[model samples]
Target: DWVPPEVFDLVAEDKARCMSEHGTTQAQIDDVNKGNLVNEPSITCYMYCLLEAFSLVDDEANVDEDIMLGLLPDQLQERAQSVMGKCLPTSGSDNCNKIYNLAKCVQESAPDVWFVI
Candidate 1:
């Protein structure tokens, strides 16, 4: 089933706007994900591998201010910041740890599903 439009739009906008800010794009994200494949593994295995690798990347690496400042579109930076501000907990806060743990759980539980086309 497809995600609700609003939810999909929000995520797509976030991804697009984030990449633009970072001087990247969905293609770049795909490339990053693709780079995780050492060889031609099944799509299911590839996704699992990517999830594992992404999970291990330092959160600070994901939010490098310089990188973000350079990459994001000027118009969307404030919106992105607003979203992040709402979602991310301040440093030294338990809420941040909780969110991190939840992310970890999702990473660990990424499903392995094979599709034949």
Candidate 2:
């Protein structure tokens, strides 16, 4: 009940546009999902775009903790909450860069929590 299928569908639609906008490939996206990341704007910007589409972050890429926790599946909330607790207050040169770093932290702490979309 935490996140409905409709929300996932919405994310999917946004993913297509974000991927196109950032020149991100399915391969790159999947790699990040598996906890493999590169410091590339293509992937990083795609993440920023996806999060923005869902109102998960603000203009400066600071995560909205409540929104993020709300979006996750119920079973994942605990782990994700812990990871967010550690990884938030995102910092970097820019929005995309901030998300890049944040994603890395999240992946390192909870490999299965932050699926790229």
Candidate 3:
């Protein structure tokens, strides 16, 4: 007598949708299984786009800056910082501040959306 609960139904539905959207091909699965995180720019770009999309859906979906700074792996943080530094505006204007803030928001929030395992 197996009875699945309501919460489980929601969880299952979310998982199915998430998998459909982000499902890796057999080749990607094999690559990961072989322990190779090699030159995958497209994968990285996909992750960034997915994070932005999720944030748009849930306005409160933001990560604390300190938490993000702490949680990110060293390599990823460095790359993100470099990109942000290059793209972020320094001028004290609304557009500049918007770019800076969005960069921080993306850096902090992206990890949750792209849960690797």
Backbone Cα, N, C clashes tallied per candidate? 6, 0, 0
Regions of model 2 farther than 4 Å from truth: 1-5
lDDT of 2 by residue, 4-114 (tens): 668667678798889889899999987897778988999999999999998999999989999988877778989989998899899999999999999999888887787
Model 1's alpha-carbon lDDT is: 0.34
Point to the candidate with the largest TM-score.
2
Instruction: Please provide, for model 1 over 1-117, each residue's C-alpha lDDT reduced to its tens digit, 9 standing for 90 to 100.
Output: 122356454445444443444344344334433332222222322332332333422333233334433434565556545544443332322323333333333233331211111
Please give each candidate's TM-score: 0.26, 0.90, 0.26
Decoy 1 TM-score against native: 0.26
Report how far off residue 29 is in candidate 3 (Å): 7.0
* Runs off by more than 4 Å, candidate 3: 1-17, 26-67, 74-79, 87-117
* TM-score preference between candidates 2 and 3, better one: 2
On residues 7-85, what C-alpha lDDT tens digit does candidate 3 reach at each position? Answer: 3453454444544565534355344334443334333323333333334212232323444344446656665565545
Candidate 1's C-alpha runs over 4 A off are 31-105, 112-117
Clashes of 3: 0
